[PDB]
Amino acid sequence: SMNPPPPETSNPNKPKRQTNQLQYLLRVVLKTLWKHQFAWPFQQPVDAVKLNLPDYYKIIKTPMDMGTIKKRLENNYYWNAQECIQDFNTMFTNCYIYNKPGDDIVLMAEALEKLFLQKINELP
Numbered sequence: 309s310m311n312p313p314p315p316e317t318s319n320p321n322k323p324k325r326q327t328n329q330l331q332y333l334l335r336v337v338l339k340t341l342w343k344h345q346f347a348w349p350f351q352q353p354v355d356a357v358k359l360n361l362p363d364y365y366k367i368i369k370t371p372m373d374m375g376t377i378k379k380r381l382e383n384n385y386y387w388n389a390q391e392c393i394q395d396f397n398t399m400f401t402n403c404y405i406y407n408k409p410g411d412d413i414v415l416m417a418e419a420l421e422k423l424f425l426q427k428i429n430e431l432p
């Protein structure tokens with residue numbers, strides 16, 4: 309199948325709040341992961357056409373990527389830090405679901421996830 313529309317990133321009728329934790333999720337966690345040498349497959353929606361993955365969105369019904377997470381943070385889409393942390397977990401999970409243990413892409417995700425977990429364990 310083709311790509312779905314990307315996930316929602318802005319909601320004008322939803323209240324906005326800025327939190328120490330959300331600030332840290334954007335300025336520390338997202339920033340650190342984004343700059344990781346293994347991050348580039350995770351910085352934008354999986355392009356099912358360019359990558360020849362016509363079953364990706366048949367298997368993955370809750371797509372997520374760090375580009376989307378970045379926009380959600382920056383637009384104050386998130387009200388609870390757990391929403392953001394869940395999105396990161398969804399992203400890593402999607403990679404594991406689509407692929408198989410031992411696949412090269414899974415090793416990249418695991419490296420990023422380990423760093424993510426360390427930074428989330430220091431959440432203010």
Ligand SMILES: Cc1ccc(C(C)C)cc1Oc1nccc(-c2c(-c3ccc(C(F)(F)F)cc3)ncn2[C@@H]2CCN(CCN(C)C)C2)n1
Nearest residue numbers: 348349350354355359372373374399400402403406407413
């Ligand atoms: C790094 C890489 C290697 C090879 C290729 C070929 C197309 C040349 C491109 C490519 O670059 C790339 N860019 C973007 C995505 C993925 C990706 C993902 C993916 C899934 C979810 C997420 C999310 F959700 F966490 F963000 C992020 C990434 N899963 C697999 N792939 C590759 C595509 C083809 N596949 C090979 C087939 N396997 C099953 C043997 C490896 N790869």
Ligand SMILES: [Cl-]
Nearest residue numbers: 342343348351
């Ligand atoms: Cl970049």
